[PDB]
Motif scaffolding. Structure first.
Motif, short mmCIF file in Angstrom:
data_model
loop_
_atom_site.label_atom_id
_atom_site.label_comp_id
_atom_site.label_asym_id
_atom_site.label_seq_id
_atom_site.Cartn_x
_atom_site.Cartn_y
_atom_site.Cartn_z
N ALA A 73 0.82 -1.21 0.00
CA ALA A 73 0.00 0.00 0.00
C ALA A 73 0.86 1.27 0.00
O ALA A 73 0.51 2.26 -0.65
CB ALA A 73 -0.95 0.00 1.20
N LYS A 74 1.97 1.24 0.74
CA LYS A 74 2.92 2.36 0.76
C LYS A 74 3.45 2.64 -0.65
O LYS A 74 3.65 3.80 -1.02
CB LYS A 74 4.08 2.08 1.73
N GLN A 75 3.63 1.58 -1.44
CA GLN A 75 4.10 1.69 -2.82
C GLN A 75 3.12 2.46 -3.72
O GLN A 75 3.54 3.04 -4.72
CB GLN A 75 4.38 0.30 -3.41
N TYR A 76 1.83 2.46 -3.37
CA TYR A 76 0.85 3.31 -4.05
C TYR A 76 0.67 4.67 -3.35
O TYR A 76 -0.27 5.40 -3.65
CB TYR A 76 -0.52 2.63 -4.11
CG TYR A 76 -0.59 1.35 -4.90
CD1 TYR A 76 -0.50 1.36 -6.30
CD2 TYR A 76 -0.77 0.12 -4.27
CE1 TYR A 76 -0.59 0.18 -7.03
CE2 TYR A 76 -0.86 -1.07 -5.00
CZ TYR A 76 -0.76 -1.03 -6.37
OH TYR A 76 -0.85 -2.20 -7.09
N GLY A 77 1.56 5.00 -2.42
CA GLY A 77 1.42 6.21 -1.60
C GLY A 77 0.25 6.21 -0.62
O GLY A 77 -0.12 7.27 -0.10
N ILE A 78 -0.34 5.04 -0.36
CA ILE A 78 -1.46 4.93 0.58
C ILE A 78 -0.94 4.89 2.01
O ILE A 78 -0.20 3.96 2.37
CB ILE A 78 -2.32 3.68 0.34
CG1 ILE A 78 -3.05 3.80 -1.00
CG2 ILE A 78 -3.33 3.48 1.48
CD1 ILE A 78 -3.83 2.59 -1.39
N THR A 79 -1.30 5.88 2.81
CA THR A 79 -0.93 5.91 4.22
C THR A 79 -2.18 5.84 5.07
O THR A 79 -3.20 6.47 4.76
CB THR A 79 -0.14 7.17 4.60
OG1 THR A 79 -1.01 8.31 4.59
CG2 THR A 79 1.02 7.40 3.64
N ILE A 80 -2.10 5.05 6.14
CA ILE A 80 -3.19 4.93 7.10
C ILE A 80 -2.65 5.23 8.49
O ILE A 80 -1.64 4.68 8.89
CB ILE A 80 -3.80 3.51 7.10
CG1 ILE A 80 -4.40 3.19 5.73
CG2 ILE A 80 -4.85 3.38 8.19
CD1 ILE A 80 -4.66 1.73 5.52
N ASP A 81 -3.32 6.12 9.20
CA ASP A 81 -2.97 6.38 10.59
C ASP A 81 -3.82 5.44 11.46
O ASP A 81 -4.99 5.71 11.73
CB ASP A 81 -3.22 7.86 10.93
CG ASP A 81 -2.69 8.24 12.30
OD1 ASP A 81 -2.76 7.42 13.23
OD2 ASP A 81 -2.21 9.39 12.44
N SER A 82 -3.19 4.34 11.88
CA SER A 82 -3.84 3.30 12.68
C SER A 82 -4.47 3.82 13.94
O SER A 82 -5.61 3.46 14.24
CB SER A 82 -2.83 2.23 13.07
OG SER A 82 -2.46 1.48 11.95
N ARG A 83 -3.72 4.65 14.67
CA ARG A 83 -4.19 5.22 15.92
C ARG A 83 -5.48 6.04 15.75
O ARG A 83 -6.40 5.91 16.55
CB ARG A 83 -3.10 6.07 16.58
CG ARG A 83 -3.52 6.67 17.93
CD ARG A 83 -2.51 7.72 18.44
NE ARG A 83 -2.40 8.87 17.54
CZ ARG A 83 -3.27 9.87 17.45
NH1 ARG A 83 -4.37 9.91 18.20
NH2 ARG A 83 -3.05 10.86 16.59
N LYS A 84 -5.53 6.89 14.72
CA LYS A 84 -6.72 7.72 14.50
C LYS A 84 -7.92 6.89 14.03
O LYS A 84 -9.05 7.09 14.49
CB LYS A 84 -6.43 8.82 13.48
CG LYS A 84 -5.56 9.95 14.02
CD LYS A 84 -5.54 11.13 13.06
CE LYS A 84 -4.53 12.20 13.48
NZ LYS A 84 -4.33 13.19 12.38
N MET A 85 -7.69 5.97 13.10
CA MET A 85 -8.72 5.04 12.65
C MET A 85 -9.28 4.27 13.87
O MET A 85 -10.50 4.18 14.05
CB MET A 85 -8.16 4.06 11.62
CG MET A 85 -9.17 3.06 11.09
SD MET A 85 -8.51 2.01 9.80
CE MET A 85 -8.49 3.15 8.42
N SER A 86 -8.37 3.75 14.69
CA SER A 86 -8.71 3.02 15.92
C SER A 86 -9.59 3.82 16.87
O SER A 86 -10.58 3.30 17.40
CB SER A 86 -7.41 2.60 16.63
OG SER A 86 -7.67 1.87 17.80
N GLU A 87 -9.23 5.08 17.10
CA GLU A 87 -9.99 5.96 18.00
C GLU A 87 -11.37 6.34 17.46
O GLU A 87 -12.30 6.57 18.23
CB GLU A 87 -9.20 7.25 18.29
CG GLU A 87 -8.01 7.06 19.21
CD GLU A 87 -7.13 8.31 19.31
OE1 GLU A 87 -7.34 9.28 18.53
OE2 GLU A 87 -6.22 8.32 20.17
N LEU A 88 -11.48 6.42 16.14
CA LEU A 88 -12.77 6.68 15.51
C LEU A 88 -13.67 5.44 15.60
O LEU A 88 -14.86 5.55 15.88
CB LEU A 88 -12.59 7.09 14.05
CG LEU A 88 -12.09 8.52 13.81
CD1 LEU A 88 -11.69 8.71 12.34
CD2 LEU A 88 -13.15 9.55 14.21
N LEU A 89 -13.09 4.27 15.37
CA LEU A 89 -13.83 3.01 15.45
C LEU A 89 -14.09 2.56 16.89
O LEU A 89 -15.03 1.81 17.14
CB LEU A 89 -13.07 1.91 14.73
CG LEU A 89 -12.95 1.97 13.21
CD1 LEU A 89 -11.87 1.00 12.74
CD2 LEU A 89 -14.27 1.64 12.56
#
Lengths: 194, 197
Positions: free
Chosen positions: A121-137
């Protein structure tokens, strides 16, 4: 000691088998389960004096759909309410696959999320902030090398009971079972197939 | 001005029925709640001109393909006076679920079972009176044959609109919309998906 079950859940072609085989050390066997007629791969793991059984449920697109696989998953969850839903999402297809996670969240299940193929995913420039996703979910989220941290979240989630979860889950699958019942009734009664 | 949404799975003969119903006089148009264009036209039913919209074929009313999002958004913001649900008789076992999903929305529905001669050829027998009795929805079969009887049923189904219908349909769709809103909120806050380069 304790005995608990993990349902490995996600959409198809998401690297689920590989994670499954790693987690069960290649020693999974097929088995028959109440509520379904198809066979599923599961493997048992001893952790200290405690046991967990991990079941690889087939990949599906909608928790409330009526494909054969979706019916299997739903019947399994209804009858064998697992202690933890381990939801595997494809990091490279995150936008498409979040819907399944959120549907499972609406059941009030005990969930941990593993974001698979984080490097690709990084190779497509896709970044995910796990901590923020986690706190929203309000659900633990880990990117997969991340494996150890995930295991820590998996074992953590297994140590506590979830009073009332099974009844929440069954309740929230009811409108789907009504539709299945209607279907059987109408077809049995009004349609002849060779 | 009364609206009929053509709803069904792919390859159910929807577009051929559409073109026959609108005399080939369909035009593309924009609709509230959707970013795509749809084909729609008019048909004279009894004394009223009625607008017919062709919704893209879908497998699952609560799925998240693009077409399935379009259908839900269209229905939410443009509740049709009639949902005209087209099923392929040869796939009645695999297509019934979409019908029952739509019925659960509390939409006003007429069912057409297309490819009826093909189904009969494969030894599939459907008792449409029985199915209709069990659904409490009008069910008619199409081959050429059955078309006029179908238009008559559509005309009757536009009589006596059920009070509260649109409000119920919107309500039943809003959990789908809550999932979508959650998805948007989370992607914006936690995910970066760059376009190419």
């Amino acid at each position: 000691g304790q005995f608990k079950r993990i349902a490995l859940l996600g959409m198809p072609n998401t690297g689920k088998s590989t994670l499954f085989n790693r987690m069960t050390g290649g020693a999974a066997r097929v088995g028959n389960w109440p509520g379904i007629t198809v066979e599923l791969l599961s493997g048992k793991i001893l952790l200290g004096a405690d046991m967990v059984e991990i079941i690889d449920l087939p990949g599906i697109y909608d928790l409330h759909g009526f494909s054969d696989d979706e019916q299997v998953v739903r019947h399994f969850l209804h009858d064998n309410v697992p202690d933890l839903a381990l939801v595997i999402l494809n990091a490279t297809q995150i936008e498409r696959q979040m819907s399944l996670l959120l549907q499972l969240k609406q059941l009030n299940m005990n969930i941990v999320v593993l974001l698979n193929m984080s490097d690709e995913a990084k190779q497509y420039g896709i970044t995910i902030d796990s901590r923020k996703m986690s706190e929203l979910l309000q659900i633990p989220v880990f990117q997969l090398t991340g494996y150890q941290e995930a295991l820590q979240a998996v074992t953590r989630a297994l140590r506590y009971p979830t009073p009332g979860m099974a009844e929440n889950v069954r309740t929230q699958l009811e409108q789907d079972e009504h539709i299945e019942a209607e279907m059987v009734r109408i077809l049995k009664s009004a349609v002849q197939i060779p």
